[PDB]
Enzyme design. Structure first.
Site, mmCIF file in Angstrom:
data_model
loop_
_atom_site.group_PDB
_atom_site.id
_atom_site.type_symbol
_atom_site.label_atom_id
_atom_site.label_comp_id
_atom_site.label_asym_id
_atom_site.label_seq_id
_atom_site.Cartn_x
_atom_site.Cartn_y
_atom_site.Cartn_z
ATOM 1 N N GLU C 58 0.825 -1.204 0.000
ATOM 2 C CA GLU C 58 0.000 0.000 0.000
ATOM 3 C C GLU C 58 0.862 1.258 0.000
ATOM 4 O OE1 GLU C 58 -1.846 2.663 2.998
ATOM 5 O OE2 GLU C 58 -3.184 0.942 3.202
ATOM 6 N N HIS C 59 2.033 1.159 0.619
ATOM 7 C CA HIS C 59 2.992 2.255 0.645
ATOM 8 C C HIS C 59 3.631 2.488 -0.721
ATOM 9 C CE1 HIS C 59 3.811 3.387 5.016
ATOM 10 N NE2 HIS C 59 2.787 2.555 5.070
ATOM 11 N N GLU C 135 5.441 4.818 11.331
ATOM 12 C CA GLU C 135 3.987 4.767 11.427
ATOM 13 C C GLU C 135 3.558 3.753 12.480
ATOM 14 O OE1 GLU C 135 1.938 4.336 7.740
ATOM 15 O OE2 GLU C 135 3.124 5.860 6.695
#
Ligand SMILES: CCCCCCCC/C=C\CCCCCCCC(=O)OC[C@H](COP(=O)(O)OCCN)OC(=O)CCCCCCC/C=C\CCCCCCCC
Lengths: 422, 101, 442, 59, 41
Positions: C58-59, C135
């Protein structure tokens, strides 16, 4: 069975604006837009605008504090009060059926509060709570300090009630504020998912009280101050602005385009900003993670424009100076004709998808219907924006580098530059 | 027919809490409603009520009363708490009714 | 009138391609639109070695593709005023774009490029190593986040659903380009993907641009086959992560849910609407209809509480979560479990007549915009196999009565061994046995 | 499926639990008493008055 | 009828993108609701 309908607008003899629009959505959303806010506060009654919006569920002359909450929740509806420094909107959402039901409590709250002394007194300590949770985001810290450092009155007044006046707002001050500002020629009954003939009937055969224009506001005198908060947070927030353009100004659109030229918030999740000359220009100067966007506010009689930089402590100096140079270079001509058209495109986009939501649509309609009692066709607002030259943009940048700056910054300001160092 | 006023004024004197310098609403037994209504009272009226009660208490332990001159007249008795108490009751009856339906 | 405006909502069109990819659209007269791809992939599809790979992916989704590298891709997307966003859950990944209705075909091309021809630059991966690792440290201070992860970790302990979406630190540390590329090829496949759109978009022109950029047909029957995930075992259990230095405590308690398919999920949402939610900024205060909220205000029981019915493919998590001060936990938990019993035992028609009205207003509010409509559409197909109009939802909801809420709740709540996640200063709340005994008799 | 069939009916609601215990105690008493009585009398045959009674009734 | 709440008292986000979207697009709205968590923009 449902089709395409027009938005209607009526101005009663009161001076009251009724902007309605049927969209055949299963959810209605009615609001009461009012020209109130902390802008009309003086040093005697600071915070009475804040306590006022918290006072929505309190008893009224037609509905108990109990029946207001119980009656609205009985039909799945909701009641909320949004307000800026110089605007106040009282919104209700519900199913199409129970409009009239929730419409009662909405009308009772805005046009007939009682502000019972004991209810007011019991509500006072909520100021501490509501302020404490809003102030959890560091931005509201410098944003309130910015207005304090930018002006001398009206807009200089804080949006959230000052600490020293918590519990010291009288029940009479609430009454006086509603009497002086919640007048017919300062309000607008704006609805969505409702027939205009009904919304009009409600506004006249129910809604009245004090007419006229009531208490006015001392127009915002500019200051140009420098408020700095040392709180040791590893991240340093900082804002640098000069006087921008007011609402409905000629230079209004020019600043909004310059904003997107410099860049205002990433459009891609976890993405770098390429179009943003501000984000990129700073990225060349500093090593570590940060955020640097273009800041632009438009008020009735004034406005602010500049940049906001969230950066690391020791790298605050690097980011702030770099962000400054980007507006210098933008004023020195560094604006491609494509950059304008690319920003004018990003801006026309942002506007359009903002009106997708029920909140965005009701607000956009009611905002204009309140000030200039009309709604502008979205095609003409698309005309007024891209009719801005490339020179208009470089001109707006020129005004920043020239005008007197005001800065607000909160964090570990051990390496955060003063305003006379830019 | 000024009979009802005759009877009330008689009972007020026969009761004799005016001998202690007490208002009618001073002698009110503090149930859940009266307690709430009392908290809604303005500071001045509350601080005054407090003194009148403490004075009656002090008198009662002395087995004395106020001089006849200082007795609260029937027509001079202020029903200072009754308007508050009626709303407290009205509000409660609403909730009790709204919670059945 | 409301009853008619439900009937008059433009139906959602569905067409399927050669390779099994579904295309769905809700056409309006919107100058803007939202269109993206909702994939049936998450952390449940992962395992011990590739945990958090789909999150690592997703990054790297927006970090450039094969046809256009990072610099070009970001510049192209920004220039059309288009917003590119996405996420990944435990059972569902999505990548979508907000743009003008005119850029719809170009957008579909941009979407199809990311899901297929992702770059995965070896140098770029090494950057997102530290990015995700940051994160993780940042989400670790979200007490609500930590609690719900702990809830899954113990409720579905020993299964795939017990894993966090972001994955382990070791996994993020050591995940390879091969591992990432493997995830994408293994999971991002046409039949398990849904191209949804909503706005001023012609459905026909949508499936055409889709037909072009979503090409290759699958050859075998296997590549047409959608995997049947192994079941996840619920465990009546608790996990208590104690930290008295933590300002306020978080507690989540849940029983096992029914799954997306079950029609009881509607009733459980009606029941959850009765108890509702609260935080100290709820202006309604002591007069709120929600009993638990009223008791929370009267006795200052908590800073906030919420009820949830998180549904998955074959299971779910019906429960509640609250934030409270160290010495108000036990009384809060007491009242909360009491209202649970109140659901199974005493629920009145008057209560659900309100709850239904709230749930009606909720599902309608869920579709305020193009993105939330696209999100519903991309999920409805992926979970129900079809679109459920608000008209149909209303029919299911309007049939809910007090006798039904009592039965459904008594079925999933009463005398069931719940799952408990507790984080922070948590002394006042203690002993599973006491919590367990709070599951029966009001 | 007795362990389940008993739970659903008897052991679920706290009411039926109590009614089970009440009626269970009634059945247990009749059973246990007769049982223990039998075990004791058989362990002592020809020793109780229960047994040697007949030898002294020429009534 | 929607929106998430919070809790604090009186008397991190350190990576370029997970704390991005904040720098005031406009300035500062202040919302409070009868039954919804106090908004802030
Ligand atoms: C004989 C014919 C007449 C019978 C009369 C019967 C009288 C009693 C009526 C029934 C009373 C019991 C009702 C239900 C009791 C109950 O619920 O127990 C609760 C609870 C367990 O409940 P849970 O397993 O959590 O339940 C979960 C399922 N809902 O408590 C128990 O376990 C009770 C059992 C423990 C008792 C131990 C007592 C031992 C003490 C020694 C005996 C001394 C006897 C002499 C005392 C006399 C005084 C000198």
């Amino acid at each position: 069975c449902p089709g395409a309908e027009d938005l209607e607008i009526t101005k009663l003899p009161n001076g009251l604006i009724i902007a309605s629009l049927e969209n055949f959505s299963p959810a209605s959303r009615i609001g009461v837009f009012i020209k109130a806010g902390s802008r009309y506060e003086t040093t005697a009654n600071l915070g009475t605008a804040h306590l006022l919006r918290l006072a929505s569920p309190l008893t009224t002359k037609g509905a108990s504090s109990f029946r207001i909450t119980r009656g609205i929740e009985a039909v799945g509806g909701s009641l909320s009060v949004y307000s800026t420094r110089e605007k106040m909107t009282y919104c209700v959402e519900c199913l199409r059926d129970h409009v009239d039901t929730v419409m009662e409590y909405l009308l009772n709250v805005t046009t007939a509060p009682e502000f019972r002394p004991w209810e007011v007194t019991d509500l006072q300590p909520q100021l501490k709570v509501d302020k404490a949770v809003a102030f959890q985001s560091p931005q509201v810290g410098v944003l309130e300090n910015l207005h304090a450092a930018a002006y001398k009155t009206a807009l200089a007044n804080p949006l959230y009630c000052p600490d020293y006046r918590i519990g010291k707002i009288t029940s009479e001050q609430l009454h006086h504020f509603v009497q002086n500002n919640f007048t017919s020629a300062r309000m607008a009954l704006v609805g969505i998912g409702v027939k205009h003939s009904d919304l009009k009937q409600v506004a006249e055969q129910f809604l009245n009280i004090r007419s006229g224009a009531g208490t006015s506001s001392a127009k915002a005198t500019y200051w140009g101050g420098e408020i700095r908060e040392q709180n040791g947070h590893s991240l340093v927030h900082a804002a640098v602005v000069t006087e921008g353009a007011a609402v409905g100004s000629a230079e209004a659109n020019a600043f909004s385009v310059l904003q997107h030229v410099l860049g205002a918030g990433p459009l891609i999740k976890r993405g770098s900003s390429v179009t943003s000359k501000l984000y990129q220009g700073v990225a060349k100067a500093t090593t570590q993670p940060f955020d640097a966007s273009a800041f632009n506010v438009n008020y009735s009689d004034s406005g602010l424009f500049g940049f906001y930089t969230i950066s690391q402590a020791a790298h605050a100096g690097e980011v702030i100076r770099a962000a400054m140079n980007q507006l210098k270079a933008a004023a020195q001509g560094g604006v491609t004709e494509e950059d304008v058209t690319k920003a004018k495109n990003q801006l026309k986009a942002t506007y359009l998808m903002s009106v997708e939501t029920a909140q965005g649509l009701l607000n956009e309609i009611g905002s204009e219907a309140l000030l200039s009692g009309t709604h502008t066709a979205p095609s003409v607002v698309a005309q007024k924006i891209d009719s801005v030259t490339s020179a208009d943009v470089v001109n707006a940048a020129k005004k920043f580098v020239s005008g007197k700056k005001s800065m607000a910054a909160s964090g570990d300001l051990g390496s955060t530059p003063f305003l006379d160092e830019l | 027919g000024r009979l009802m006023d005759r009877i009330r004024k008689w009972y007020y004197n026969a009761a004799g809490f005016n001998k202690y310098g007490l208002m009618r609403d001073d002698t009110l037994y503090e149930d859940d409603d009266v307690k709430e209504a009392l908290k809604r009272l303005p500071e001045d009226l509350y601080n005054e009520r407090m003194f009148r009660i403490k004075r009656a208490l002090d008198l009662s332990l002395k087995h004395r009363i106020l001089p006849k001159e200082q007795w609260v007249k029937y027509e001079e008795d202020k029903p200072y708490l009754e308007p508050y108490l009626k709303e407290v009751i009205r509000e409660r009856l609403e909730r009790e009714a709204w919670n059945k339906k | 009138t409301y009853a008619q405006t439900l009937q008059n909502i433009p139906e959602t069109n569905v067409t399927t391609l050669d390779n099994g990819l579904r295309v769905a659209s809700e056409e309006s007269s919107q100058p803007t639109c939202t269109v993206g791809v909702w994939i049936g992939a998450g952390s449940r599809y992962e395992n011990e070695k590739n945990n958090g790979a789909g999150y690592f992916v997703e990054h790297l989704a927006f970090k450039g593709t094969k046809k256009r590298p990072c610099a070009a891709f970001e510049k192209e997307v920004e220039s059309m005023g288009a917003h590119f966003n996405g996420y990944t859950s435990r059972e569902q990944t999505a990548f979508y774009i907000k743009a003008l209705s005119k850029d719809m075909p170009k957008v579909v091309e941009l979407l199809a490029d990311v899901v297929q021809n992702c770059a995965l630059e070896e140098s770029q991966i090494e950057k997102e190593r530290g990015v995700i690792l940051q994160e993780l440290k940042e989400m670790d201070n979200d007490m609500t986040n930590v609690t719900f992860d702990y809830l899954h970790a113990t409720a579905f302990q020993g299964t795939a659903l017990a894993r966090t979406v972001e994955g382990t630190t070791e996994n993020i540390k050591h995940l390879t380009r091969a591992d990432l590329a493997s995830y994408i090829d293994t999971h991002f496949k046409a039949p398990r993907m849904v191209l949804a759109a909503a706005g001023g978009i012609s459905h026909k022109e949508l499936v055409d641009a889709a037909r072009q950029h979503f090409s290759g047909v699958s050859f075998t029957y296997k590549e047409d086959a959608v995997p049947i995930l192994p079941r996840c075992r619920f465990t009546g259990s608790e996990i208590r992560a104690r930290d008295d230095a933590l300002p306020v405590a978080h507690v989540a308690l849940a029983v096992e849910g029914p799954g997306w398919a079950d029609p009881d999920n509607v009733v459980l949402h009606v029941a959850n609407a009765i108890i509702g939610r609260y935080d100290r900024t709820f202006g309604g205060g002591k007069h709120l209809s929600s009993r638990l909220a009223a008791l929370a205000v009267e006795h200052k029981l908590c800073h906030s509480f919420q009820t949830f019915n998180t549904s998955y493919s074959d299971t779910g998590l019906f429960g509640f979560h609250f934030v409270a001060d160290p010495l108000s936990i036990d009384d809060m938990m007491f009242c909360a479990q009491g209202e649970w019993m109140r659901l199974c035992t005493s629920t009145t028609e008057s209560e659900v007549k309100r709850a239904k009205n709230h749930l009606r207003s909720a599902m309608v509010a869920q579709l305020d915009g193009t993105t939330p409509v696209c999100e519903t559409i991309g999920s409805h197909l992926l979970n129900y196999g079809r679109r459920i109009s608000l008209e149909e939802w209303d029919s299911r909801i309007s049939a809910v009565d007090a006798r039904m809420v009592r039965d459904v709740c008594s079925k999933y709540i009463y005398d069931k061994c719940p799952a408990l996640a507790a984080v922070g200063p948590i002394e006042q709340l203690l002993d599973y046995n006491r919590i367990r005994s709070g599951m029966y008799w009001i | 499926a007795l362990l389940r069939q008993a739970y659903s009916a008897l052991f679920r609601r706290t009411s039926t639990f109590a009614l089970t215990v009440v009626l269970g105690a009634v059945l247990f008493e009749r059973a246990f008493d007769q049982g223990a009585d039998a075990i004791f009398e058989h362990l002592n045959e020809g020793k109780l008055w229960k047994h040697i009674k007949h030898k002294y009734e020429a009534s | 009828x929607x929106x998430x709440x919070x809790x604090x008292x009186x008397x991190p986000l350190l990576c370029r993108e997970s704390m991005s979207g904040r720098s005031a697009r406009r300035d500062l709205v202040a919302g409070i609701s009868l039954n919804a968590p106090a908004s802030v923009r």
